[PDB]
Ligand binder design. Structure first.
Ligand SMILES: [Mg+2]
Lengths: 524, 524, 75, 73
């Protein structure tokens, strides 16, 4: 292939143009009164949404280099959402502001390396300011309070969130299922959650979710890496005849078996998904077994002499529901006998007795928690199926905010928190004058999400910003009601964790672009 | 897939150009004397029509963005028809007027957000004015009166409509069937209608209707979600040899089974359709059974231990006709024994005795109504098959108008009602000067359908409008006869519901465009 | 700007600014659908009232200090 | 404009000046609020009056222009 290469300003200007296109299209939908964007799906009718994430996903640019700028911002913004659950649009807004002013600064003749350093210093100071600003959320009242707010003022949604946390605990596992009837149901059932993503994105049957949902599937537990499809055939054929989905847990799966399963699942006879086993080395041995007891299945070990070919359905565990996402796997309502499950716990409790090491005691304790703690689930009831499914999405959105709120507390969500921190370190200074400029760029950039909200609303950004600056703490302007007051009390707030992640990611990508001196791409 | 992005005026101007093309082509056919448009078939003789809906459906634009503007208007206009049965062309006309003047205002430096707000306020005031203007329809004479008018002055069509409603009530279920002979038939037969749409658009065998008509189909009742084609096979094969259509009622159908049926149905060996069961949770249990008794079928429940694979024809209910639209499913003339059906009603009547809650009393009562009320149908007779089907279309058109008229009453249909309301609130003012401009745009826009009618006729729009303004109530100009008088008495009127829906939808899309700051599309 | 210079030789920059403000807002009003001739009359009537108000606010400058202050501000 | 040229919010300063009474105003040079006459900032009445009248006379006529005629490029 032949490559097109641009240096310095020629490279940076194209990235700037690229980022601005992505940013301009996505920023309009940020406010509660946010403006909407119309996307052409491909076939049939158009789609109109106020969802920045939906708009961001779709954007690709004809002009290479400019396209790279947009894509570079999209990756970082996506990561913020992944680690916070919200702020994808906000991160992009902040990124544009930092980048645009920072790029003008490098073009002007000021040192780029210093500008990054100044920006990072302001970002680091701002993060601490958020920590002080943030209001704690530990009790049931706070849990419910944030949950109802996130749930768009629905008191019942907050109530279930608090109740779930109250039973399983803050760190427990909570899942959401479609409701059978009008009434909302909260149940606790044996189950386990662990961090392990799906090997293939192709497996996902729920594209909006980005996760894979399986109904009462069989569970295959293995003690070896699987690279060959031959082992799978007797069990595989058996599940197909059965008519139920199959979930696989093992060391790893190689492309010879993995690729065939991926192709087999997409528009194929049997649709199955597989994930890697939790833990590593010696630890995985115990970890796989705990899952087996829970599911009521049988572990197959090469060391024993047992093989997959020699395995039958009776050797497979079962759960009513299992889901998988980009990096997490969880199972719901394992079939394993209560006597077996509880007895297994007793065996583990007994293991704890040696207490050889704090690490070993703890690690065994963690196993106890996963196996005995169980999984709590929520069913969402509604008058109509659209409302039910709609409500379910809201519940899930509230849950992410509540967990983030718990972990780092909450701050004003009108973009006010960025405003408050920017005003607090107005006098912050750097060693180099160029560094000082970087500091102002970062602080000034912080202001933009508020202004964007107000701009979308059709109100003056400058007039609202100045008044917000005047007050102290969580005081700010609510765009939806056009009223000034304590944003938290009013009902507008963001988790501390999401605001921090958005700001940090925006700064990371911005600084990164500033120090980039060369770009390489294919010819048009 | 490179994207072309336009913002501000560049984006809005293209939408304006796009909407105007769609609007200009469709508006000419609005009047009774309206100008005809010629649509060119790809291989053959062209079709000429005065029907705005057919014109609008056909329109697509080469220029991306402009195409989006037209499409955005078409979607909203279609919705008005969906919720009113008429006014699709009228909504588009109103949309153009609001949009054109509103866009000029935004490009003139006036605030867009305020203009939307002003327009909405005028719309809100206009709706109530329509409510006062509206003449109620309740008695048989009014039902027949509106029905005959809608039926293009055919007294007999109105008579059947009023008689149908008299037999089953205003909220009862009325359907239209092709006539066996010259004489028109009105019959009442056991049957049921419920609000459930079709899972696949591909199922529709009547593309002008947008609904699926089946002849004496077998009916499959299921108690579980269906995701696998295997359960279907023994029953599916059984219906195929028989040579009759099959209708499925279950919790839901997943893509593994749904997708195969969809492909199988579209020019395949067995053509079948499936819908979701009415109600949910505990309620669905009783309702599925009611359908079973009505069609003489057998319910299959997993709870019992009964499975779809273990089923035969004897377990399938039957009805002479069934029709499925975009969101509603109804069945005609169930085979179930009268003793069984009436007896089943007695069991439900007995159930009503606990009277634990008004909701439960009501919900049970509703079940009685569907099962015992029955379905009334209309057969349309005519001298020739072309006339018979043509007349049938007219009957259906009248029925939608009669239901809309019943629910909200009627208003003058010459575009006069918009005129009357616009003159009433000429004074109305808003907080912002820009808002005031929005109000005038909306009110001025209201005038346009009248003017368009007069323009089409070859008469002076300004002259006729001025005289109409002078009079009060339902007084106005009839374009067809070139005479002034009471439009309702003369024979020209629109249901209150359709006028309202057209106006509201036009304002919603117009405001929406006004606040749109960015558009995204693929390269040309 | 040129006429203002002829009348007093100072404030020409300020006069231009007023023209900018009036014109931009006036055109915006014309866009709104208002009669331009009437807008001109409104402006002129407001100006006539404004002039009288300026005369009332105006105080005599007779001392050396006041004179020095106007020269200093001008320069 | 004076405030804008000073790199400060024009609307913010205007709102505070509007709030005050008499000769209260903002001094751009010292970046603070006080009595304009005490400070020594003076505008001769004739220039102030003339600026307003000359600007308005041309502006009123200018805004009323429906059509203009000129030579081709
Ligand atoms: Mg001077």
């Amino acid at each position: 292939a032949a490559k097109d290469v641009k240096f310095g300003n020629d490279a940076r200007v194209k990235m700037l143009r690229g980022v601005n296109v992505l940013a301009d299209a996505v920023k309009v939908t940020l406010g509660p009164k946010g403006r909407n964007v119309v996307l052409d799906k491909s076939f049939g009718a158009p789609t109109i949404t106020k969802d920045g994430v939906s708009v961001a996903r779709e954007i690709e640019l004809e002009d290479k280099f400019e396209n790279m700028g947009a894509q570079m911002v999209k990756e970082v913004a996506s990561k913020a959402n992944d680690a916070a659950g919200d702020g994808t649009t906000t991160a992009t807004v902040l990124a544009q502001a930092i980048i645009t002013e920072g790029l003008k600064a490098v073009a002007a003749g000021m040192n780029p390396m210093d500008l990054k350093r100044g920006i990072d210093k302001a970002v680091t100071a701002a993060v601490e300011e958020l920590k002080a600003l943030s209001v704690p959320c530990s009790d049931s009242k706070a849990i419910a309070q944030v949950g109802t707010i996130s749930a768009n003022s629905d008191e019942t949604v907050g109530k279930l969130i608090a109740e779930a946390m109250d039973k399983v605990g803050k760190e427990g596992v909570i899942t959401v299922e479609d409701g059978t009837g009008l009434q909302d149901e909260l149940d606790v059932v044996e189950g386990m959650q662990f961090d392990r993503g799906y090997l293939s994105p192709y497996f996902i049957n729920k594209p909006e979710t980005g996760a894979v949902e399986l109904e009462s599937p069989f569970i295959l537990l293995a003690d070896k890496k699987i690279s060959n499809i031959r082992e799978m055939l007797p069990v595989l054929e058996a599940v197909a005849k059965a008519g139920k989905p199959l979930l696989i847990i093992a060391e790893d799966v190689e492309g010879e078996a993995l690729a065939t399963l991926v192709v087999n699942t997409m528009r194929g006879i049997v649709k199955v998904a597989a994930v890697k086993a939790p833990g590593f080395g010696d630890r995985r041995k115990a970890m796989l077994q705990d899952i087996a007891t829970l599911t009521g299945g049988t572990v197959i070990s090469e060391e024993i002499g047992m093989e997959l070919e020699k395995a039958t359905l009776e050797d497979l565990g079962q759960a009513k529901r299992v889901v998988i996402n980009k990096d997490t796997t969880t199972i719901i309502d394992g079939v394993g006998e209560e006597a077996a499950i509880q007895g297994r716990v007793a065996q583990i409790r007994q293991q704890i007795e040696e207490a050889t090491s704090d690490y070993d005691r703890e690690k065994l304790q963690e196993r106890v928690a996963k196996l005995a703690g169980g999984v709590a689930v929520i069913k969402v009831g509604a008058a109509t199926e659209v409302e039910m499914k709609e409500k379910k999405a809201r519940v899930e959105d509230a849950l992410h905010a509540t967990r983030a709120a718990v972990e780092e507390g909450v701050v004003a969500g009108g973009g006010v928190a960025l405003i408050r921190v920017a005003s607090k370190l107005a006098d912050l200074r750097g060693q180099n004058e160029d560094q000082n400029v970087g500091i102002k760029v970062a602080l000034r950039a912080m202001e933009a999400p508020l202004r964007q909200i107000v701009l979308n609303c059709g109100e003056e950004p400058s007039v609202v910003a100045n008044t917000v600056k005047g007050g102290d703490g969580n005081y700010g302007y609510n765009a939806a009601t056009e009223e000034y007051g304590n944003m938290i009390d009013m009902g507008i707030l963001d988790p501390t964790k999401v605001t921090r992640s958005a700001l940090q990611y925006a700064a990371s990508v911005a600084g990164l672009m500033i120090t980039t001196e060369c770009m390489v791409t294919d010819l048009p």
